């Protein structure tokens, strides 16, 4: 149907906007602490601690399959990146601190993304 196509075009345009959001958030992680999944070879107990691991590469895979239906879903995954790190790692660590800085800086980006998503529809 034409209605299904129109819905697909809206999903495609959301995907474009989320790709730009993702790039902007990842630039706030110049150390690349959040770039890839935590390695279970190197942290063999990780899944005992963290039930839903997340990282920027995994988000990018979902994005390119147009797997985010709305901004809320994408924000959920970004929040997992931060939240998982702040649980596993102590306050005095470079990992925890990197997550705090990512959260704070990403807040700015996400605030305007929400406006754009509501605005363009």
UniProtKB/Swiss-Prot annotation:
Residues 9-113 form the Bromo domain. Highly expressed in testis. It is found in: Nucleus; Chromosome. There is a cross-link at residue 41 (Glycyl lysine isopeptide (Lys-Gly) (interchain with G-Cter in SUMO2)). It comes from the Eukaryota. Component of some HBO1 complex composed of KAT7/HBO1, MEAF6, ING4 and BRD1/BRPF2. Component of the MOZ/MORF complex composed at least of ING5, KAT6A, KAT6B, MEAF6 and one of BRPF1, BRD1/BRPF2 and BRPF3. Interacts (via PHD-type zinc finger domain) with unmodified histone H3. Interacts (via PWWP domain) with dimethylated and trimethylated 'Lys-79' on histone H3. Scaffold subunit of various histone acetyltransferase (HAT) complexes, such as the MOZ/MORF and HBO1 complexes, that acts as a regulator of hematopoiesis. Plays a key role in HBO1 complex by directing KAT7/HBO1 specificity towards histone H3 'Lys-14' acetylation (H3K14ac), thereby promoting erythroid differentiation. This is Bromodomain-containing protein 1. It comes from Homo sapiens (Human).
